[PDB]
């Protein structure tokens, strides 16, 4: 069903609800079938996955029937389809993690070039639109270039990355000096 976009280095919460509004057993796993985490009573057990240290739940919410999966310090390679198994019902959440960095250049001079590169999971087909501080709207794809920065381009750029019909927004600080 659901598709969720996350940002590299940030944290996401994938949701799972039971029709029952009481505390019952549940577990999460990835598409490669490897168990992420689940429970015995209200004892949380983590599993084998490469997600181990970065995966957690929210123990306090189990009573209302929220058994969320929380994944911290997101990597691009956390992009996967995740599956929540509750009351023998299955609930599917697809995660795509994107990153957007200035190559190796945030402090530039007037007249110089800016080039941002987008990082995305396998099979993606994204595009990027940024707005400069002076409100000029710029398009790109894997790469986004500005060839001749002005003094008014110094400040926070707001860049939105879109895959099909879901978007994630970035803020990038760029210094342009004389």
């Amino acid at each position: 069903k659901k598709v969720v976009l996350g940002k590299k280095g940030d944290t996401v919460e994938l949701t799972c609800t039971a029709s029952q509004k009481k505390s019952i057993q549940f577990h999460w796993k990835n598409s490669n079938q490897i168990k992420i985490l689940g429970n015995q009573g209200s004892f949380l057990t983590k599993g084998p996955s490469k997600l181990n240290d970065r995966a957690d739940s929210r123990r306090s919410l189990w009573d209302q029937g929220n058994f969320p999966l929380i994944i911290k310090n997101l990597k691009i390679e956390d992009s996967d389809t995740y599956i929540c198994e509750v009351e023998d019902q299955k609930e599917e959440v697809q995660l795509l993690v994107f990153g957007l960095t200035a190559n190796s250049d945030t402090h530039l001079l007037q007249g110089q070039s800016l080039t941002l590169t987008l990082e995305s999971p396998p099979g993606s087909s994204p595009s990027v639109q940024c707005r400069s501080p002076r409100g000029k709207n710029i398009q790109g794809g894997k790469t986004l270039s500005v060839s001749q920065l002005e003094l008014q381009d110094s400040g926070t750029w707001t860049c939105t990355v879109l895959q099909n019909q879901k978007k994630v927004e970035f803020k990038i600080d760029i210094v342009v000096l004389a």
Partner: antibody, heavy 122, light 113 residues
Framework: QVQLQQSGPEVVKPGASVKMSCKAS????????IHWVRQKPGQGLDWIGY????????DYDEKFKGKATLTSDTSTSTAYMELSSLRSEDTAVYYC???????????????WGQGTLVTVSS | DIVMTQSPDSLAVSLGERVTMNCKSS????????????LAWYQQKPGQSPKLLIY???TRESGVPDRFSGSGSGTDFTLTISSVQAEDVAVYYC????????FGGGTKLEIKR
């Protein structure tokens, strides 16, 4: 059944521009990415780039940046490719193709147009 | 871009024999996370558009005869035709969709009779 119907063959002069179309049907236009691909006569397939019809966002292979421009019309369910500053070596069949699925779950080209042959000559 | 290399460029095979076509990428197409290879094969018969045969390296598209099979992993892949039929004359392309999209240069299949 999904179909991609491309415009007819065209001659175009060395140095000018051509604009061709790809009409999609049998599915919701803004749901899937459309790609374009070049095939020079007797040669292989060169991926050009793609358009996300949802917001007309775009991406181009290195080789085609500045050479091609992709747009789409949501109401008529049609994607366009324009090629500019054409030279003799640009003579080719150009295909549009649709990804099988979205959100990286069907990234291969499951549906193809029949191609548009563009000849570059004065 | 990832570079896709096919070999040989062309192949002649007697009706009914087995055919193997190789595709090599400049970098791994195996996604460690889901263990899937982001690789497809297409068939392009003379005069026609390419047609999808195989995706995820080895899943046969619906309607494709099971004489067509894919294999390989990481950076090296094979398309096999277990017993070539007359209708199989075509050029075969592999395509990676791991990071953007790139096609190999094709293998043309000819038939001996």
């Amino acid at each position: 059944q999904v179909q991609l119907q491309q415009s007819g063959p065209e001659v175009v002069k060395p140095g000018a521009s051509v604009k061709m179309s790809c009409k999609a049907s049998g599915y919701t236009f803004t749901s899937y990415v459309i790609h374009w691909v070049r095939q020079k006569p007797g040669q292989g397939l060169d991926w050009i780039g793609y358009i996300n019809p949802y917001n007309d966002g775009t991406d181009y292979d290195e080789k085609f940046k500045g050479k091609a421009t992709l747009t789409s019309d949501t109401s008529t369910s049609t994607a366009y490719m324009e090629l500019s500053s054409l030279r003799s070596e640009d003579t080719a069949v150009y295909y549009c193709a649709r990804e099988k699925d979205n959100y990286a779950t069907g990234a291969w080209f499951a549906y193809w147009g029949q191609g548009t042959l563009v000849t570059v000559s004065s | 871009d990832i570079v896709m290399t096919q070999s040989p460029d062309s192949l002649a095979v007697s009706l009914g024999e087995r055919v193997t076509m190789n595709c090599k990428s400049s970098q791994s197409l195996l996604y460690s996370t889901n263990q899937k290879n982001y690789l497809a094969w297409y068939q392009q018969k003379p005069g026609q558009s390419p047609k999808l045969l195989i995706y995820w390296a080895s899943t046969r598209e619906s309607g494709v005869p099971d004489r067509f099979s894919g294999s390989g992993s990481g950076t090296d892949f094979t398309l096999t035709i277990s017993s070539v039929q007359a209708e199989d004359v075509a050029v075969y392309y592999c395509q990676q969709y791991y990071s953007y999209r790139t096609f190999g240069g094709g293998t043309k299949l000819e038939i001996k009779r």
